[PDB]
């Protein structure tokens, strides 16, 4: 209707969404900040229409997530500290329930790594444990947890989990596709 | 030449199809999509005519499927409701609501199947009945003047007598005329038999399709898992659906707990203790639980027996079997949980034991109820020989059970959740003991018990839909009311549990229990159809000596006698029994083979 | 209006209209009975 | 303290148990064994009394098992024979001989089961029969004086008439007295029924145990394989059993050929060709093959029908059904292979098609033979009403079929292998065409056809062992003769094939075919027992209206009537049919689930 | 009888054989060379009674094997170019049919490697192909075969198969336990 | 010795003893009918 169809066909071909989901997400994005989002949004405007990280993290589905910053950063475009409509659609098509297990595993691994070197180092594990727990476990407890995780999840003796072993170990979890889910 | 072109076109089409399942940015995805689209557009002329037509019709089918999905999304209800429940309470509480919505869809499909082919043709035929008709069916569709006055008594209506007895809701209302009329020739008894068969077939098909979709994709890689304690409790320790502050703090505390006793248990690894008092308490609990199960059986049997009246001698005492069954079903689990608390087991094994005991109670109660109802029907038919209508009576019993179960569920929601919450809020300051932190803390959702309620109700619907054609139609309203009342109760009166465990951490556990219940409920319907004989003044099968005759009478109209006699030897006991034993043996050995293969699949990885 | 043949319809109608009014009232409201753990801890501390 | 000691003892015992399965030198293995033995000896005093007794009895059981294995190895025959055949011809030729030796062991076990409990008690009772006996059984154990003179006619003996008819080899010879005698009270009809049941149960159990042993260990890791062409054809390209020079050169040539067309086929990857002549030849071959199958059916039916005489009108024409069946079975595969050669398919797909056609021919012939025999028996019983003995007659038919099959196999070995080899050796110099290199090259072993012969013969034995108690005893001699003649023929007349392919490269293919044959053969026996009625002057069941009565008559002697009547409702068609349909549906869906799991097991590796 | 029992119990505990198999193999070993094998063989004599490689390769079960030298070398004792009774028992217990798949795979890998560095290099593959084929394939054919085998059997990009990948690829062969078998 | 009642036993006995003698003879012998491929190639070359 208001938008060109070809955009809708492209979005449905790229994402898991339908026309209703695209329209609902556009309404939510516009309601996030009406000043920085125009009404008519035909053309390359979705690539240039942008919002900051604070506005996206203000949303209820992301506000209470300890890894809200990581979720915003993983789906970020070439611009740093920013999110566009295409990034919004990536974020809410990866996180949806209809997404396959492989995509969830891959983006979860990309989220859990802060440096971004395709390797789950000790510092990343400690940072994510302290983010999830909010500094309630003792330092000795954190070290013990990381040591056990490395022992039972590292097979190459590298003291750092990678994509293969992480995917092997947490894809047989009967609670991953149930937990790693955001409804919108 | 052509082979390479076809291979390239197939590869490009496969890339386009699997485009969404790759972790690329939308710019990269759009680039690849446009590149492949241009490649296919320029390469479409290289293939032959057959390949071009195949691709064209495949594209048309894909476009039609996409349009159908776009239109179908508009009709899915309770999106915001489940979204809110998920945000406030978690992703294991909302499993019950997603299960209930799927059950609603299945029940609506069953209702449409039984309404298009049975109820509507009969109503249309009744509305246009001429003088020649309306007399062959007056004895079943018109309430007699003797009992017409007493149709509104608050006990005739409550027992589904009066006008409801002579309504399309029951089996005996339908005429046994072989054809609806001239120029149409619609066989209604055959429609009745085929619809009852089709509903069970579709129930099996839908349950198995859901099970396959959940197992082949979701939990396909989830099998063959070994140990992995800390990684499971850490990487899957946060529910991403939760968008509530208090629930998030509760989840953080739960994760800290889980990790702390994880390291505590893995540290000592020492398990030495033996107290005679604890063992005596455990055996006493296990004995009193079996005593309560026996009491349940005896109460159900007594309740069925004492309802020995068919004429209106008294109705304040006839309606006691639905009340007794509902009371047992809705009260005994609470006592089970109390005895389990006294037992003092580990929380996971305590929950598993409670679920097992509830399942055993439900199955035993259902079996004894069926046996008592069948014995009562046999005794009534023997004493009868103005012929009685045992099918309509069985339908009435099942409908009354469903209605009283709904009433008891509503009362339980009102008392356990609302009134208890109000009492704790407005009376914990000056109570004798600290109730807000004591045994009745504030109230919590019970996903497993509620799902078992849904499964038991659906089993009751499956059991009695042959005798009550409009039982799924009533179940639609019952399920909608249940969804709304459960959502409101959980939103208003319940608090998120500190940590909630799962029976097997699988979505197919409840589907498997539902499939077992479907088999358990289709066994006695098949036995009734094969063994029992219809009534001579009721229903569409009043002109036959069996229920299945209306089918076989038409099979014999097209098949010779000699070939039929040759076929009738496949039903020999000496051919069925070896086949059953062979299936049992092959299942037993294939069980060990499959368990070994599944165990070695992870080892070979 | 016989008690066993006309009164119960009147009672049922009154109950039904009251139930409809209550449901509509609780449809536009967002009651929340239990108090948060912070309030419980504050009350316990007193 | 005690927990650590128990864990250490368990670990040391586990190390000792799995010692042989590790790749260590003998010195290292001895060192580890002595170390663990000393550790256990010094640590045995740390455990409690219960653990000590458990370990002591486990050690005693292990010692007894080892002694039993040591004694059992002494009784395994044909070790050097199979060793020589393996060395000369390979490890796929010797698969037939290992299969035949296992079949011999199974048949010997069946013979012992049917000989301890049936034949021996009856013979002992007959030898001690007093004047009171020997008159109730004279009509079945003594040949009448009318036909005693004509007992040796070369046609009475060849048809198992005369003395063989009144021998323990047949059903009608056994008395129907409920007890063998006083002070013993041995129920012989019950022994007969129970032995016939036990033989089938043990056959199923042994076949399934062999299948499980071969699948859970040998081919457990062999499943879920993908591509791997060159590595399979190279690392498993040499048979390590071969110890012959010429066979080794043949194997080297075969490996070279395999690799050469491997690279040749992987190189071009181009498959474009369509000749109408080739397609016409293929469809003509497929039509003539079905024509030959129909000719086989018609010939079998005609042969059974024309043997309509029961009295000794003529015997040179009555013995034509075993000859016809044997001729078809032993000749049609050759024509199948000739037609396949004309078809010009790939060798592997040609072999698969030939095996499938042979299996279809065998199954169809067996089914039509059973139907014709059953129809003939029904017609004979109807025309009878000095009562005839249809069980003894069926036993005679099966025994004659087995004997003629042995004769035809011996003749085929003598002609195809010996005489053809001699003709090629002594006549290829001056023949019209080069036969030594032409179509009849020199002769080769056919593992699949011979294994199918063994399976078909065992199916014939299973079918007719209820009517002929001493049919497995005869099959023992038949199988020993077959083993010796096949070994001699392959050693003396056959040459190693240039390259021999396998049907599925599995050892459980033939076991699965054998299990299917066992089911196919136990179906008619169960039908006979459940449906047909015994003879009133034959066998141990002459006092009952059914075969199974002798069982139920004793079940009713201990079980009440009311509970029996309640149980008799489990055999309703309306309970069996939904159960059968549920098993069918669960098998169908579990098939897709298992195939997906097996496919993804390799992917997850 | 002639021999002490304790030796027989040790041999049964270590190998797959029974007393009859031990006696038969001892008779065959003595018949291989009666001069170098004493009649009474009690004590540590099995470790010191030794035969050369030529005598063992002269046996029919090993004479036609292209890898007879490798089979003799893998099971060889500390002494180079020698085989003792314990080596005989190791060789004929590994090769037997009752041996598990793992032992066959491991000793086959040890046989197929000539240098003995736990790695299946290109030179080992070429040597074993030319030994199995007897120099009938062309050089280009051998290079193509090795290239395809490396491509379809190497996953780490090392251009040299190791224990793990070899075991993964040839243990699913339905003809390995049937071929890798020596009856004696 | 009737042809149909006594001759066939004599024929069977003669055949059985001849078969036993043949089997015993071929028991201590190692016949091998086909010639090796080398001999076939030599004959073809001539
Ligand atoms: C507020 C909006 C009101 C919209 C009115 C809709 C009218 C009700 C239609 C039936 C409602 C069925 C229902 O409750 O939804 C369940 C059901 C699916 O359940 P879930 O699997 O749990 O959800 C999908 C997540 N993977 O939803 C649907 O399928 C939508 C059906 C709408 C009509 C579709 C028309 C085609 C139906 C024939 C399909 C045959 C399949 C066999
Ligand atoms: C020359 C030596 C002569 C020895 C005379 C032995 C007398 C014959 C005894 C029966 C022969 C049975 C036979 O043919 O052997 C087959 C059979 C095994 O067949 P395969 O699995 O193919 O071989 C094992 C390779 N894994 O061999 C045996 O089992 C030996 C049986 C000897 C007697 C054992 C006594 C115990 C029998 C009861 C076992 C019950 C199991 C059920
Ligand atoms: C046969 C028996 C028939 C009885 C029918 C009773 C139907 C009542 C159930 C319907 C219902 O509960 O509606 C839901 C309603 C509020 O639900 P909710 O969507 O959460 O509120 C929206 C706020 N924005 O929930 C409510 O308003 C409160 C529910 C009151 C309980 C009704 C029964 C009392 C007796
Ligand atoms: C009912 C019909 C009963 C007929 C019984 C016939 C029994 C003959 C089969 C027995 C047999 O073939 O014995 C094997 C014998 C040689 O076998 P082999 O072990 O290889 O020789 C050892 C050499 N060291 O093989 C032979 O000696 C040659 C076989 C001759 C064929 C006998 C039948 C001819 C008719
Ligand atoms: C298709 C799915 C939804 C199942 C619906 C039930 C089917 C099996 C039932 C419902 C109505 C039935 C038909 C009703 C009337 C007729 C006309 C007459 O010639 C007898 C058979 C026939 C043709 C019946 C065949 C079976 C039938 C088609
Ligand atoms: C054990 C395996 C080998 C099966 C053998 C067949 C079994 C089932 C058969 C063979 C002989 C049978 C017994 C024969 C005679 C008696 C004595 C009398 O009281 C009736 C039952 C009883 C006791 C039978 C029970 C069943 C029986 C033991
Ligand atoms: C573990 C389950 C315990 C459930 C206890 C329910 C208590 C219900 C009390 C109802 C009180 C209603 C009157 C309130 C008076 C202020
Ligand atoms: C009463 C037992 C019900 C069994 C449910 C079977 C579920 C089938 C799916 C498998 C889920 C794994 C847990 C079991
Ligand atoms: C492919 C199977 C072909 C089988 C051909 C068998 C030929 C048998 C010929 C028998 C000749 C016997 C007389 C020999 C005269 C020297
Ligand atoms: C006539 C078909 C027979 C099927 C045999 C089933 C064998 C079961 C073991 C599986 C072996 C794999 C090849 C199939
Ligand atoms: C209607 O029923 C009455 C019952 O007495 C009957 O007499 C009448 O014939 C029926 N209708 C017709 C066909 O007139
Ligand atoms: C033996 O059989 C004869 C048949 O006439 C019978 O008369 C006799 O009584 C039987 N034996 C006895 C019991 O003497
Ligand atoms: C009546 C006493 C309880 C009987 C049922 C116990 C079921 C336990 C199920 C445990 C499954 C792991
Ligand atoms: C009668 C024509 C042949 C019919 C049987 C063909 C069986 C082919 C089996 C192929 C299995 C892969
Ligand atoms: Ca890192
Ligand atoms: Ca190397």
The H-or-E segment that residue E51 falls in is strand E50-52
- For B428-507, where are the alpha helices, taking DSSP H only? 447-463, 471-493
Contact D510, D99 (CB under 8 A): yes
Residues β-bridged to residue A161: A120
**How many angstroms separate the Cα of B48 from the Cα of each of B3, B8, B60, B82, B387?**
11, 14, 18, 51, 72
Q: Tokens 């008819």 correspond to what residue?
A: D165
The H-or-E segment that residue E82 falls in is strand E82-84
Same domain, D195 and D256: yes
What are the respective helix, strand and coil percentages of chain C, to the nearest 5?
60, 0, 40
Question: What angle (nearest 5°) sits at the alpha carbon of residue A63, between those of residues A57 and A68?
Answer: 60
Q: Is C4 on the interface with B (CB under 8 A)?
A: yes
Name, in order, each residue with C-beta under 8 angstroms of B93's C-beta and a sequence gap of 6 or more.
B85, B86, B445, B447, B490, B496, B500
> Which residues from chain D sit within 8 angstroms of residue E66, using beta carbons?
238
Rounded to whole angstroms, the Cα distance separating E168 from D76 reads 35
Other beta carbons within 10 angstroms of residue D253's beta carbon come to 16
What are the respective helix, strand and coil percentages of chain E, to the nearest 5?
55, 5, 40
Question: Smallest Cα–Cα separation from D140: which of D560, D449, D541, D445?
Answer: D541
> Which residues from chain F sit within 8 angstroms of residue D443, using beta carbons?
34
Q: What is the token pair recorded at D39?
A: 């550790």
Contact D230, E179 (CB under 8 A): no
**Domain count across chain D:** 3
Q: What is the dihedral of CA D294, D297, D302, D305, to 10 degrees?
A: -150
Rounded to whole angstroms, the Cα distance separating D500 from D93 reads 9
**How many angstroms separate the Cα of B154 from the Cα of each of B310, B468, C5, D599, F6?**
18, 21, 7, 63, 102
- In terms of residues, how long is chain A? 184
Residue E115 assigned as binding residue:
yes
Question: What angle (nearest 5°) sits at the alpha carbon of residue D70, between those of residues D69 and D72?
Answer: 60
Rounded to whole angstroms, the Cα distance separating D547 from B214 reads 50
The parent domain of residue B38 ranges over: 2-73
Q: What residue owns the CA closest to ligand 14's atom 2?
A: D286
DSSP-assigned letters across all residues of D315-354: STTTTTHHHHHHHHHHHHHHHHHHHHHHHT--HHHHHHHH
Q: What is the token pair recorded at B501?
A: 């465990």
Q: What is the token pair recorded at B167?
A: 């309504």
Q: Tokens 């005329």 correspond to what residue?
A: B177
Question: Smallest Cα–Cα separation from D484: which of D78, D76, D73?
Answer: D78
Q: What is the token pair recorded at D598?
A: 């097996």
Chains contacting C (3+ CB pairs below 8 angstroms): B
Rounded to whole angstroms, the Cα distance separating D380 from B445 reads 74
Rounded to whole angstroms, the Cα distance separating C31 from C26 reads 8
User: In chain F, what's the furthest Cα-to-Cα distance?
Assistant: 60
**How many angstroms separate the Cα of D355 from the Cα of each of B279, B587, D508, E20?**
65, 28, 16, 41
CB burial class (10 A; 0-12, 13-18, 19+) of residue B573? Answer: middle
User: What is the nearest CA distance from D457 to chain B, expressed in angstroms?
Assistant: 22
Give CA A144 to chain center in angstroms. 28
- Resolution in Å equals 3.1
Contact E122, E150 (CB under 8 A): yes
Rounded to whole angstroms, the Cα distance separating E90 from E97 reads 14
Contact B238, A132 (CB under 8 A): yes
**Any idea what DSSP says for residue B470?**
T
Task: Estimate the crossing angle of helix D321-343 against helix D447-463, to 10 degrees.
Answer: 150
Contact D445, D497 (CB under 8 A): yes
Name, in order, each residue with C-beta under 8 angstroms of E134's C-beta and a sequence gap of 6 or more.
D252, E66
Strand duo E50-52 + E82-84: pairing: antiparallel
**How many angstroms separate the Cα of D6 from the Cα of each of D17, D40, D597?**
16, 11, 38
- Cα dihedral sign, D550-D551-D556-D562: negative
Question: Smallest Cα–Cα separation from D482: which of D116, D103, D8?
Answer: D103
**Any idea what DSSP says for residue D529?**
H
Q: What is the dihedral of CA F3, F7, F11, F16, to 10 degrees?
A: 140
Strand duo A82-84 + A50-52: pairing: antiparallel
Task: Estimate the crossing angle of helix A85-94 against helix A101-112, to 10 degrees.
Answer: 120
Contact D81, E30 (CB under 8 A): no
Q: Contact B215/D585, CB-based, under 8 Å?
A: no
Contact D530, D548 (CB under 8 A): yes
The Å distance, Cα B454 to ligand 12 centre, comes to: 77
Rounded to whole angstroms, the Cα distance separating D544 from D527 reads 17
First and final CA of chain B: distance in angstroms? 40
Give CA B371 to chain center in angstroms. 22
Q: Tokens 């003991």 correspond to what residue?
A: B433
Rounded to whole angstroms, the Cα distance separating D524 from D370 reads 8
Residues β-bridged to residue A50: A84
Task: Estimate the crossing angle of helix B508-531 against helix B347-384, to 10 degrees.
Answer: 10
Phi, psi (5° rounding) for residue D464? -105, 20
Rounded to whole angstroms, the Cα distance separating D83 from D87 reads 6
Strand duo A82-84 + E82-84: pairing: unpaired
Contact B507, B435 (CB under 8 A): no
Chains contacting A (3+ CB pairs below 8 angstroms): B
**How many angstroms separate the Cα of B584 from the Cα of each of B589, D459, D583?**
9, 22, 10
**How many angstroms separate the Cα of D441 from the Cα of each of A179, D342, D345, D350, F41?**
70, 17, 20, 19, 14
Scored b (16 or more CB within 10 A) or e, A37-51 reads beeebeeeebbebbb
Other beta carbons within 10 angstroms of residue A82's beta carbon come to 15
Rounded to whole angstroms, the Cα distance separating B78 from B101 reads 8
Question: Smallest Cα–Cα separation from D443: which of D470, D413, D484, D466?
Answer: D413
Q: Tokens 């479409």 correspond to what residue?
A: B44
Other beta carbons within 10 angstroms of residue D261's beta carbon come to 10
Question: Smallest Cα–Cα separation from E132: which of D83, D242, D444?
Answer: D242
Rounded to whole angstroms, the Cα distance separating D317 from D320 reads 6
DSSP-assigned letters across all residues of B309-350: --SSS-STTTTTHHHHHHHHHHHHHHHHHHHHHHHT--HHHH
Phi, psi (5° rounding) for residue A39? -70, -65
Rounded to whole angstroms, the Cα distance separating B336 from B332 reads 6
Same domain, D92 and D201: yes
Q: What is the token pair recorded at B459?
A: 């089993």
Nearest by CB to residue E179, choosing from D82, D223, D240, is: D240
Residues, CB within 5 angstroms of ligand 15 (ion) = A 113, 115, 119, 121, 124
> Which residues from chain D sit within 8 angstroms of residue F5, using beta carbons?
152-153
**Any idea what DSSP says for residue B186?**
-
Rounded to whole angstroms, the Cα distance separating B546 from B530 reads 7
This structure was determined by cryo-EM
What are the respective helix, strand and coil percentages of chain B, to the nearest 5?
70, 0, 30
SS3 E50: strand
Question: What angle (nearest 5°) sits at the alpha carbon of residue D14, between those of residues D13 and D15?
Answer: 90
Same domain, D471 and D583: no
CB-side neighbour CA atoms (13 Å) of D547: 23
Q: What is the token pair recorded at B193?
A: 């038999």
Rounded to whole angstroms, the Cα distance separating A50 from A33 reads 10
**How many angstroms separate the Cα of A123 from the Cα of each of A143, B234, B436, D227, D421?**
11, 15, 42, 42, 80
Question: Smallest Cα–Cα separation from B462: which of B523, B386, B547, B506?
Answer: B523
Mark whether D and B touch (3+ CB pairs within 8 Å): yes
Phi, psi (5° rounding) for residue C23? -65, -45
User: What is the nearest CA distance from E36 to chain D, expressed in angstroms?
Assistant: 21
Same domain, B256 and B308: no
Rounded to whole angstroms, the Cα distance separating B372 from B3 reads 70
Question: Does B377 map to a domain?
Answer: yes
Rounded to whole angstroms, the Cα distance separating B464 from B395 reads 6
Q: What residue owns the CA closest to ligand 8's atom 8?
A: B512
Q: What is the token pair recorded at E30?
A: 């003595």
Nearest by CB to residue B74, choosing from A20, A47, A148, is: A20
Name, in order, each residue with C-beta under 8 angstroms of E184's C-beta and a sequence gap of 6 or more.
D83, E25, E28, E61, E92, E95, E96
- D495: region left, alpha or beta (phi > 0 left; psi from -120 to 50 alpha): beta
SS3 E161: strand
- In terms of residues, how long is chain D? 605
User: In chain A, what's the furthest Cα-to-Cα distance?
Assistant: 60
Rounded to whole angstroms, the Cα distance separating C5 from C2 reads 5
Rounded to whole angstroms, the Cα distance separating D29 from D31 reads 5
Question: Does B325 map to a domain?
Answer: yes
Boundaries of every domain in chain C: 7-45
Name, in order, each residue with C-beta under 8 angstroms of D338's C-beta and a sequence gap of 6 or more.
none
Residues β-bridged to residue E120: E161
- Cα dihedral sign, B309-B312-B317-B318: positive
SS3 E83: strand
Query: What is the 3-state secondary structure of chain A?
Result: CCCCHHHHHHHHHHCCCCHHHHHHHHHHHHHHCCCCCCCCCCCCHHHHCEEEHHHHHCCHHHHCCCCHHHHHHHCCCCCCCEEEHHHHHHHHHHCCCCCCHHHHHHHHHHHHCCCCCCCECHHHHHHHHHHHHCCCCCHHHHHHHHHHHHHHHCCCCCCCECHHHHHHHHCCCCCHHHHCCCCC
Scored b (16 or more CB within 10 A) or e, D458-468 reads bbbbbbbbbbb
Same domain, B296 and B366: yes
- In terms of residues, how long is chain E? 184
Helices and strands in chain E, H and E counts: 12, 2
Query: What is the 3-state secondary structure of B240-309?
Result: CCCCCHHHHHHHHHHHHHHHHHHHHHHHHCCCCCCCHHHHHHHHHHHHHHHHHHHHHHHHHHHHHHHCCC
Name, in order, each residue with C-beta under 8 angstroms of B102's C-beta and a sequence gap of 6 or more.
B210
Question: Smallest Cα–Cα separation from D373: which of D403, D358, D395?
Answer: D395
Query: What is the 3-state secondary structure of B486-546?
Result: HHHHHHHHCCCCCCCCCCCCCCHHHHHHHHHHHHHHHHHHHHHHHHCCCCCCCCCCCCCCC
**How many angstroms separate the Cα of B334 from the Cα of each of B329, B449, B487?**
10, 10, 21
Q: What is the token pair recorded at C21?
A: 């009014």
Q: Tokens 């037993």 correspond to what residue?
A: B588
Contact E105, E115 (CB under 8 A): no
Q: Is E102 on the interface with D (CB under 8 A)?
A: yes
- For D131-244, where are the alpha helices, taking DSSP H only? 138-141, 145-148, 188-213, 229-235
CB burial class (10 A; 0-12, 13-18, 19+) of residue A30? Answer: middle
Q: What is the token pair recorded at D592?
A: 């897709």
Contact B498, B250 (CB under 8 A): yes
Contact D470, D452 (CB under 8 A): no
Q: Is F22 on the interface with D (CB under 8 A)?
A: no
Rounded to whole angstroms, the Cα distance separating B460 from D179 reads 54
Question: Does D143 map to a domain?
Answer: no
Scored b (16 or more CB within 10 A) or e, F10-24 reads eeeeeeeeeeeeeee
Q: What is the token pair recorded at A156?
A: 């190459």
Residue E32 assigned as binding residue:
no
* Chain breaks of chain D after residues with C–N above 2.5 Å: 385
For the Cβ of D321 lying below 6 angstroms from any atom of ligand 14, the answer is no
Rounded to whole angstroms, the Cα distance separating B27 from A86 reads 8
Rounded to whole angstroms, the Cα distance separating B192 from B122 reads 11
Question: Does B198 map to a domain?
Answer: no
């Amino acid at each position: 209707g208001v938008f060109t169809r070809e955009q809708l066909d492209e979005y449905q071909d790229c994402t898991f969404f339908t026309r209703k989901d695209i329209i609902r997400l556009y309404k939510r994005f516009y309601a996030l900040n009406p000043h920085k989002v125009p009404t008519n949004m035909q053309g390359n405007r979705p690539a240039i229409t942008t919002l900051t990280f604070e506005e996206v993290e203000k949303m209820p589905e992301l506000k209470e997530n300890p890894f809200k910053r990581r979720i915003c950063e993983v789906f970020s475009e070439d611009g740093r500290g920013n999110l566009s409509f295409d990034d919004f659609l990536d974020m809410f098509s990866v996180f949806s329930e209809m997404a396959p297990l492989q995509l969830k595993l891959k983006y979860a691994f990309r989220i859990y790594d802060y440096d971004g070197d395709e390797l789950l180092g000790h510092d990343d594990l400690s940072k994510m444990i302290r983010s999830l727990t909010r500094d309630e476990l003792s330092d000795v407890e954190v070290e013990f947890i990381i040591e056990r995780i490395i022992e039972e999840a590292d097979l190459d003796g590298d003291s750092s989990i990678n994509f293969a072993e992480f995917e092997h170990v947490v894809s047989r979890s009967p609670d991953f596709i149930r937990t790693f889910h955001i409804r919108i | 030449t052509r082979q390479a072109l076809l291979e390239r076109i197939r590869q490009k089409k496969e890339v386009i199809g699997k485009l969404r399942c790759q972790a690329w940015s939308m710019t990269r995805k759009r680039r690849t999509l446009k590149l492949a689209q241009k490649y296919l557009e320029q390469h479409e002329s290289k293939v032959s005519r057959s390949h071009l037509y195949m691709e064209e019709m495949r594209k048309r089918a894909r476009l039609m499927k996409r349009s159908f999905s776009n239109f179908k999304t508009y009709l899915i209800p309770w999106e915001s409701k489940i979204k809110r429940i998920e945000s406030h309470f978690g992703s294991v509480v909302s499993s019950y609501f997603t299960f209930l919505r799927w059950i609603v869809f299945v029940n609506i499909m069953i209702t449409l199947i039984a309404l298009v082919f049975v109820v509507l043709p009969e109503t249309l035929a009744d509305s246009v009945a001429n003088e020649g008709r309306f007399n062959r069916t007056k004895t079943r569709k018109q309430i007699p003047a003797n009992e017409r006055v007493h149709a509104d008594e608050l006990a005739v209506v409550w027992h589904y007598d009066g006008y409801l007895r002579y309504s399309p809701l029951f089996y005996g209302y339908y005429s046994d005329d072989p054809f609806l009329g001239n120029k149409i020739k619609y066989a209604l008894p055959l429609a009745y038999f085929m619809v009852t068969l089709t509903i069970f077939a579709y129930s099996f098909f839908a349950i198995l399709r859901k099970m396959a979709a959940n197992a082949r994709m979701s939990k396909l890689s989830g099998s063959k898992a070994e140990q992995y304690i800390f990684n499971w409790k850490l990487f899957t320790g946060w529910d991403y659906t939760i968008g509530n502050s208090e629930t998030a703090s509760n989840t953080v505390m739960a994760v800290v707990i889980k990790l702390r006793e994880s390291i505590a248990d893995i540290k000592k690894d020492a398990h030495g203790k033996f107290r005679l008092l604890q063992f005596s308490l455990r055996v006493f609990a296990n004995i009193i639980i079996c005593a309560m199960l026996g009491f349940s059986i005896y109460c159900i049997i007594f309740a069925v027996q004492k309802s020995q009246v068919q004429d209106d001698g008294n109705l304040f005492t006839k309606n006691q079997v639905p009340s007794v069954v509902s009371t047992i079903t809705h009260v005994f689990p609470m006592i089970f949980d109390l005895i389990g608390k006294m037992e003092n087991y580990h929380p996971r094994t305590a929950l598993r034991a409670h679920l097992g005991r509830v399942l055993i109670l439900y199955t035993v109660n259902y079996i004894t109820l069926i046996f008592a109802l069948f014995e009562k029907m046999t005794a009534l038919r023997d004493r009868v020989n103005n012929d009685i209508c045992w099918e309509t009576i069985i339908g009435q019993e099942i409908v009354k059970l469903v209605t009283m179960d709904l009433i008891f569920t509503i009362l339980s929601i009102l008392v356990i959740d609302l009134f208890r919450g109000l009492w704790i809020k407005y009376c914990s300051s000056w109570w004798c003991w600290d109730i807000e932190t004591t045994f009745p803390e504030y109230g919590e959702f019970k996903v497993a018990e509620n799902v078992l309620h849904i499964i038991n109700n659906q089993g009751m619907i499956w059991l009695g839909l042959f005798f009550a054609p409009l039982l799924p139609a009533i179940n639609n309203i019952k399920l909608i009311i249940l969804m709304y009342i459960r959502g409101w109760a959980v939103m208003t009166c319940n608090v998120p549990a500190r940590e909630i465990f799962r029976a097997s951490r699988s979505s197919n556990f409840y589907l498997g229990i539902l499939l077992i219940w479907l088999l358990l409920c289709t066994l006695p319907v098949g036995f009734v159809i094969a063994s029992m004989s219809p009534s001579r003044s009721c229903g569409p099968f009043a002109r036959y000596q069996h229920f299945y005759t209306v089918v076989t009478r038409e099979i014999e109209k097209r098949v010779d006698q000699t070939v039929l006699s040759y076929i009738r030897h496949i039903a020999s006991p000496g051919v069925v029994i070896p086949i059953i034993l062979f299936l049992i043996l092959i299942i037993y050995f294939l069980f060990s083979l499959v368990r070994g293969l599944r165990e070695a699949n992870t080892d070979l990885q | 209006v016989a008690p066993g043949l006309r009164l119960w319809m009147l009672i049922a109608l009154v109950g039904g209209v009251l139930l409809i009014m209550i449901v509509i009232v609780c449809c536009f409201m967002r009651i929340r009975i239990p108090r948060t753990k912070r309030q419980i801890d504050l009350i316990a501390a007193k």
